[PDB]
Write a protein that binds this DNA or RNA. Structure first.
Ligand SMILES: [Zn+2]
Lengths: 207, 102, 76, 186, 187
RNA sequence: AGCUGCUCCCUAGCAUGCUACUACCG
RNA sequence: GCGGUAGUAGCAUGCUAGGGAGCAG
């Protein structure tokens, strides 16, 4: 709670991952080794090793998900459409994504009109549709994070509310489980950047 | 519980794929949408029960028009293997009565 | 008669979309605005003038849909 | 399914036992038909089952094939069905302004930009021959989309001004004809 | 399933029963050669029903290890993909500006948000309207983030090249209007 | 191109369970 | 005459797996 108040004073380029240079068989990388949170302070990793020999499947998986080497090798970006902090541009051009209209099932509509629907003054009418969007739809929707502001709490009131709220959750039981006990519905969904260049979640749960 | 009638009718008229604009290819979409619309039959407003009745009539029409294709374009005689339960109200009334079958 | 104008607007925007109109960003923006404002109208005198201006777009692109045989296939 | 081989055997056994119960002599000489017969129902119900559900399996395979064929041939014809649909729907709407602009476009007069709605703002229309110029433009007032527009400037296909009273019958074969009128809404 | 050890045995039992049926002598003819047949019952039940289970289990096993071989190949494929990507983005990175800022850090660590801000060679700006254009990057060189930049190329929302003379207050309504400016760091 | 929950339809399989016919021994 | 087991056929209930679809946050 105190960190939230004190962190509004310091420059916003000082928060985020902290990077370092390591060597993989004599070739230098740039990887994350910590984090500076606005709420939790400075955190340092416990297993960091310069000069490793190879990379397993797991270490490649961890280095590919890191934003360190994606952002350290792109262009600088000054996006003036938002007030949010922009970091880097990962290509040479901007992408403008649209949304399409719906499809009209004319057979059902004709059948329904031959049974007396959609008359003048009826109580049932059409108000649900597929609305279309133009190229500036994604960034204008991302710009709604300007409503998130730093909020400091009444701490002595919160430390009591949390106990009562915890009393609401007493009948359940939890804990950790192993990898052969977890259940996935629909292993045919996306894996999410950069992993959607090579397969779906099935590929990574099988490999 | 019952839904807004405009939601069900809109799910009938507007779709997100061109294949779903032919009814005889799926039919199950309309069976599910008719499950969702059964409790409107008990409403005091008469233009609300007509939605459930319209769905049942459309399901029957689609079944007939699918079966009357295999007898002409081909020479296949389809038998009504108890597919007549879908255009009667008992199959749908059973989903809101307390004795499960999930 | 409001229902018909709304359904026709949906079909119109589908035709315009598959005629490769979103390769011009300003034209596509105007078309999307007209479509979305027809779908929200509550007065059948605005919807028809907006439909007039939205069909003018397809009629501008001469040499992309052949207007004659379509109007003579059976229906106008 | 009765045209099957073991039908004859089963029918023979059951007719023999019908005779045996209509004669009623022994208990195991009549059990002959039953030691003899339960074999008939062990080789007729064992063969009047597999083909009976095979009859349904075949019909369900052919319905699946038909559905895949129809599904794949529906999405190879989107941009002909869509335009045919649009024009039937526009015909049954039966609006005066839409019919005006559609008939004009069918005979040659098309716009060059979106039709404006404000009482200000400009409209440009291509006019391809004298005959279609008679019906719409008379004086300095234009009749289009069931409205009235006031002419401001006419230029030729040579991109040079032509004064308005020049356009008439005799001088029509003197101008590269696809002119462009420019009008503002009244 | 005909080359089993008991096909011959049930065959000879029924063949002797056929021989005696062509004979038809005694009550023991019936009893015996329905029990020569009624012994060759277990043969052709277990030897033709345990042979009907081992084969299903063998097919199960073969299909399963087919699956495992394919899953083992796709793993190597994706491993190669990830390695090539990492080593490819490695070679736009190892400059001297990077080492210069890294060696000025007291313990080796730096924030990640200041690496493109201080070492990148190219800048991209996205402009919503002309009023913003006048206040950010008018001219042919401008200063951003404590450095000097030099414009090369301007494109619009359709990815078409604009020339710097067209961008004006009265030509503004004729442009597709997010413009994207590309500049290079001046030395 | 996400995370969850519920419901309908179709096929495969497993054991189980009920039920019917044949054989053997007791 | 009955029991036990071994086979073969038909029927239900439950569980798992796979595919198709619908709604809600
Ligand atoms: Zn734990």
């Amino acid at each position: 709670n105190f960190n939230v108040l004190f962190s509004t004073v310091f420059p916003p380029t000082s928060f985020g991952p902290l990077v370092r240079k390591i060597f993989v068989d004599g070739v230098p990388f740039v990887v994350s080794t910590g984090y500076h949170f606005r709420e939790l302070g400075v955190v340092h990793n416990q297993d960091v090793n310069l000069h490793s020999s190879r990379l397993s499947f797991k270490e490649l998986l961890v280095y590919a998900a890191d934003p360190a080497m994606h952002a350290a090798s792109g262009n600088l970006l000054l996006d003036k459409r938002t007030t949010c902090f922009s970091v880097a541009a990962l290509t040479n051009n901007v992408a403008f994504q649209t949304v399409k209209p719906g499809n009209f099932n004319k057979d059902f509509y004709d059948f329904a009109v031959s049974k007396g629907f959609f008359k003048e003054g009826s109580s049932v009418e059409l108000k649900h549709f597929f609305f279309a969007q133009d190229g500036n739809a994604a960034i204008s929707d991302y710009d709604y994070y300007r409503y998130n502001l730093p909020t400091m709490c009444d701490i002595r009131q919160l430390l009591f509310v949390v106990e009562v709220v915890d009393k609401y959750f007493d009948c359940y039981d939890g804990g950790c489980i192993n990898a052969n006990q977890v259940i996935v519905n629909n292993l045919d969904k996306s894996a999410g950047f950069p992993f959607n260049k090579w397969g779906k979640a099935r590929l990574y749960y099988d490999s | 519980p019952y839904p807004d009638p405009s939601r069900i009718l809109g799910a009938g008229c507007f779709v997100d794929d061109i294949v779903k604009t032919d009814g005889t290819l799926m039919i199950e979409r309309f069976v599910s949408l008719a499950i969702d619309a059964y409790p409107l039959t008990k409403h005091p407003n008469q233009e609300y029960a007509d939605v459930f009745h319209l769905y049942l009539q459309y399901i029957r029409k689609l079944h007939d028009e699918l079966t009357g294709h295999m007898l002409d374009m081909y020479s296949v005689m389809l038998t009504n293997d108890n597919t007549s339960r879908y255009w009667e109200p008992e199959f749908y009334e059973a989903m809101y009565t307390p004795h499960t079958v999930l | 008669k409001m229902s018909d104008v709304k359904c026709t607007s949906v079909v119109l925007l589908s035709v315009l979309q598959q005629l490769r109109v979103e390769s011009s960003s300003k034209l596509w923006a105007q078309c999307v605005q007209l479509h979305n404002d027809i779908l929200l109208a509550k007065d059948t005198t605005e919807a028809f003038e907006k439909m007039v201006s939205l069909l003018s777009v397809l009629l501008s692109m001469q040499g992309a849909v052949d207007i004659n045989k379509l109007c003579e296939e059976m229906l106008d | 399914f009765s045209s099957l081989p073991s039908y004859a055997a089963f029918a023979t056994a059951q007719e023999a036992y019908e005779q045996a119960v209509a004669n009623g002599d022994s208990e195991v000489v009549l059990k002959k038909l039953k030691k003899s017969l339960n074999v008939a129902k062990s080789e007729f119900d064992r063969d009047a089952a597999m083909q009976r559900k095979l009859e349904k399996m075949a019909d369900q395979a052919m319905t699946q094939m038909y559905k895949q064929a129809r599904s794949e041939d529906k999405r190879a014809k989107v941009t002909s069905a869509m335009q045919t649909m649009l024009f039937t729907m526009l015909r049954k709407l039966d609006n005066d302004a839409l019919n005006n602009i559609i008939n004009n476009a069918r005979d040659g007069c098309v716009p060059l930009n979106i039709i404006p709605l404000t009482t200000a703002a400009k409209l440009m229309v291509v006019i391809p021959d004298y005959n279609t110029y008679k019906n719409t433009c008379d004086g300095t007032t234009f009749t289009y989309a069931s409205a009235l527009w006031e002419i401001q400037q006419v230029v030729d296909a040579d991109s040079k001004i032509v004064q308005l009273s020049e356009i008439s019958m005799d001088n029509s074969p003197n101008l590269a004809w696809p002119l462009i009128v420019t009008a503002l809404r009244a």
